[PDB]
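In the previous chapter we treated chains in isolation. Here, by contrast, the input contains seven separate entities that must be folded as one system, with a combined length of 686 residues.
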Amino acid sequence: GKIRQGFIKRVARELVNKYPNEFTTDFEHNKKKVQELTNVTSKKIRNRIAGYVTKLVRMKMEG
Amino acid sequence: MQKARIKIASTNVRSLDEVANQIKQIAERTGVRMSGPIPLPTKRIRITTRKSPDGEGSATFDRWELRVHKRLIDIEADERAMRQIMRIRVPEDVTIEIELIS
Amino acid sequence: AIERYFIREAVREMLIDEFLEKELRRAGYGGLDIKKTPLGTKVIIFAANPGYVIGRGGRRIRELTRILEKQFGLENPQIEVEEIKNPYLNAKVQAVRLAQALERGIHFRRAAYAALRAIMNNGARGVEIRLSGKLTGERAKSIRFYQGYLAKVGNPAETLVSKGYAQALLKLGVIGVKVAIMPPGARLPDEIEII
Amino acid sequence: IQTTGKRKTAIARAVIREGKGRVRINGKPVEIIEPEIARFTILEPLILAGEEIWNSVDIDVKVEGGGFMGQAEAARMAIARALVEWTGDMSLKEKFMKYDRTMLVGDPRRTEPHKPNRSTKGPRAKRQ
Amino acid sequence: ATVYDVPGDLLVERVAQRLKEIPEIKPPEWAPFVKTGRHKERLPEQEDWWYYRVASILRRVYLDGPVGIERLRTYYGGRKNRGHAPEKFYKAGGSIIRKALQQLEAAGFVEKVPGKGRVITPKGRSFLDKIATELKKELEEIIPELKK
Amino acid sequence: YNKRKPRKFGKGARRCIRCGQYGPIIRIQGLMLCRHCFREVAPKLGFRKY
RNA sequence: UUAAUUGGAUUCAACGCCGGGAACCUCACCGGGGGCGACGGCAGGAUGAAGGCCAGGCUGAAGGUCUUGCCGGACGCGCCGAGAGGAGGUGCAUGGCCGCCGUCAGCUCGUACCGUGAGGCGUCCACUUAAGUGUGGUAACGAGCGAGACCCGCGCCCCCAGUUGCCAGUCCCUCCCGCUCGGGAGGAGGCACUCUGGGGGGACUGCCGGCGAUAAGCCGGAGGAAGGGGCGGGCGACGGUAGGUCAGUAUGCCCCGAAACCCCCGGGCUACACGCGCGCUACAAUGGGCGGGACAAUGGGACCCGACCUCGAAAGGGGAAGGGAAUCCCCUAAACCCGCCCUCAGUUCGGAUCGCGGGCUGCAACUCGCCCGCGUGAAGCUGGAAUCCCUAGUACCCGCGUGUCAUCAUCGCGC
C-alpha cells in the first residue's frame, strides 16, 4: 500500500496556503523549506511531506 | 614519556559523550596532547526467556538486551592535566577506570 | 568483570526497591536513586509523604539505615527523602493510592472517577485505569475508565506512557489495579507544529 | 591503488601496482587454487579485461571472513574495481556491467536472523 | 620459489618421500597399533602414514610458525560419528604429533620457543624451499603458466 | 539435625533470590533469578526490547 | 505394573510442554527414621535443664531410643485458645502473566437525526489499500484506541576517531631460498584500507510514459547501492475463550497442627505386551576409507579460560605463561575438493545390543551418567491410507557457539 498517510496530506495543505510563493517543483528546495518551517525530526516524514507538497505545487499551476 | 589511559564504560550513550567531551575540553585548555576518544566495540548482553509463566499454549520467547558502550581516551603526562579529572562530575551510570602505562 | 558488576548493582538496586515498596506502602513510596561516592552509598527516596518516612523523631529512617547496611551490605547508606513534584503524574503513586482507597471500602466507581478527575485536573493528557477481579459479585470482571489522548502501542507508548500496577486486598480476595498516564509534556511523532 | 570488496561476510582488500602480471591471493599464486570453480570466479574479470591489462599490472588481494566461495567472490569484486580504477576506462566498465551487474555493484545480501519455533533450522522453519 | 608456489598435497608427498631417508624419523613401536585420532574409526591404511604426518607437520610449521601441540590437535582433528546421535568434531590425539615433533627437534629442522610452541629452523626452510623449487620447475614444464 | 546439608552443586544448591524456587535460575553474569522473576525486573535492570 | 512410578496439559491452541537436564538436593510419590508445634491461659518451675554427653544395645546411623550417670547453670513437660508452615484442595474464588480468535480491521464515543422502543446512522455505497488505508457521493458532522507513524539491526555515501587492523606505502635491519630478476618471514616503520562506533547524508511515486474521475490510487521505465510499508525485527486494541497457571511469587474459602509443619536414609519419579506425539540415525555408490588443502560467525571465560611444556594409544594425569577482556584462551572448523585403496553386496553401510579393561564428575552412578580401546554388532535394502513446512539468502544440507550445565543434547536460543 502506497497510500500517503492522512496526516502528511493534512499538513501539506497549510504550507501551500500560508507560503505558496516559497515552494517550487524542486523537491530539495521544498524539502529544506518544510524542514525549517516545521519541527519534524523524522527524515522519512520530512521526505514524504516534501514529495507531497511538490505534487501540490505541481497541481497549483496545472489548473 | 608516560601515558595515562582512561576507560569510560556506560550503558547511556549521551552520558558517555558528555564525559568524553568534558575530558576533551579539559585537554586543550590544559594544552596537553590528548589522543581522541576511540570507541571500542559495544558489548551486547542478550537473554532469551520463554514468555509463558506456565507451559501451556504456543511457545514464545522474549529477547532482552543491554548495550554497554566503551570509549578509550589516552592523554599525556602533565600533573596539572591529570589533576583536573577527579574534579569532573561523573554520572552514576558511567564508570571510569584510569591506569598509567609507561 | 564489568558486566558482572553493572547488573549486580542493578540487582541490589531493584531488590532495595522491592523491599522498600513492601515497607513504605503506607508512605506512598514513589521511587529510588542510588549514587556512590568514596564516602558511601547515598540513597535518594521519592515518596508521597516524607513525613511518614521520617516517622517519629527519625526512629523509622534509622532502622531502615541499619537494614540497607545489613541485609544488602550497603557501605554507609546515607538516606535522603523527598517529595515528588506531582504525584498525579506518577502512575505508581496513583495506583498504590487507589489500591489503598479500595482497601478502605470505597465504591470502586466513585474512587476511580475521583482519582481520574483529579489526575486530569493536575494537567494530565491521558489517563487509563483498569480494575480487574471481584468488584460486584463472585465472578471477576475487568472494567476500564479512560480519558483523554493515550497512545497504547509502539515505541512512543513504551517511551512516554507511565505504568503503575498495584493490588488491593479485601475480604473476598484481591483486585488488580493498572494505571497508565500520558504526561502532557510529551509530544507524539506525528505532532508537527507549523511556524 | 587500493580497492575493497565485500561479499556476505568475506572482505577482500586489493592493492594494484605496475608489474609483470603476478596476481596473488593471500600471497598465493592464482593458478594453483584447488577449488576450480572458485578459480574460475576469481579469473572471470581479467578474462574480459584482456591479456594486455593482465600482463601490465601486478595485484595482491588478501581476504578474510566468510567461506571459500565468498572469499573468491570478494576477490573477484576487488579485481574488477582495481582494474576499472587503474585503467580509468568506461569501455571495460560497461563490458563488465554487461557480463555481470554485481561485478561493480556487489551483492548486499545478508543472512536473516533465525527465529523461534525450532530456531535451529532457520528463520522460517517450524515444527510439524 | 617457496612452498606457497606449489600445491599442498604434492609438496607433502615429496617431503614425505624425502624424509623417509633421514634416520632421525622412525615410527615408534606403538605407531602401527594406534589410529591417528579418536575421531577416526578405522586404522590407518598405508604403512607410510607416519611420514606423511611428519611431512605435514613441518609444512604447518612453515606457515603457522610458533605452534603448540593443542593447535595441531585441533587442526588434525575431525568429524566423528556418534552412532544414532549426530556427528561431532573432535581434536586429534597428542602423542603421535608429540613424538613426530620431538623427532623433528632431534632432526634439527625445528626448534622450540617456550611459551609459544615450535618454529622452523633455517635448515628446514632451505630444505622445503629446495623441494618447492624442484616441484615448481617440473610443473613449469608441465604447466608453462607457472613460469610467470 | 534440622540443618540442610551443604549442596554446592545440583538444583538444590541454587535458589532464586526473589521467589526462592529451586527450578529455572538464570546465571548469566550473576543474576540468580527465577525465570518468572526475570520478566518483572528486567526493565528495572535497564533491559530494553529490540 | 508398582508400596510409588507425584500432578497439570487433550485437535487447531497438550505430548524435547510446565520439568529450562531428577544419583541426594529438585520432591509434591512410597517406605522408614528423627525434631518440633510462635505467643497467651491451666499446671509446673529452680529442688535444676529444655539440650548435649561417654561404654554399649537397639538404631542403615543419628544421647534419636534406652542401661548408666554427668553436665549444662538456666525457666520450660503436658492440656486449651491460637499458631508458623503447607508443592494440601478449589484457575468455574482471584490478581498477574501467557496462548488462541488475531499484527486480524476491529472496537468505540460527543452532538445531530430516524423508530413508541429494542435500536439505526456516522461505521454505508463505487474504486483503491496490508489496513474503519484514502479518493467522490452519502443524514450526518467530528474525535479516540487500533492500522500507520514510532523504535532496533542490515543494506550505500560522507564526517570524525585510531596501540582493532597494515610485506597499503614507508628510510632501515635480520633470516630463507632464488632461475640472482625476485619473492616470503620477523622486526623497525604509518595510519592508508578494512574493522572499530558517535554524527550526518542516501529513496521521496523523486522523475518519464501509460492506466485510473484528471482525484485517491495502480502499472511499466529510467536514474540509482537501495523502490515503492527497501529488507528483517520489536510494539497485539476493546473483549471473548469460567482457554493454562493459586505447582514461581501475590491472594479468597476449606483443611492440615506432633500432622498435609520441619529435618535425615533409601527407593521411585527411568519401571513396560503395548498404541500415540516430536525428533535422532540410517535403510549405501552422489558409497566407505587413508593422506593433504584452503577455508567463518555468534558468544563465553577467575574455583574459570587455560595457551605453552611434559607423560600416556585415547579417554586423561602433572607443571604452566597470559588472560576480570578489541590485546590471552575456548579458536580450529564441518559440509568442499584433490591423490590413492575397497568396489553394488543387509554387505563395508548399519549399528541397536551385550563382555572385559581404562579414564572423568560428584561423598555416592546397580537401580541410574559420560568418554575411551578391543570383541559382538541386529533390525534396517525406500515406507499404504493421510497429513506437515516453506517462496530468497529463504528451503534443504553442514557443522559451530550458548542456556540449563561438576557430568549428563538427539533438547531450546543463536551463529
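The longest helix of chain F spans residues 35-45. Residues 1-5, 7-13, 16, 18-28, 34-37, 39-40, 48-50 of chain F lie near RNA strand G (CB under 10 Å from a C1'). Compare these points with the single-chain example from earlier in the chapter.
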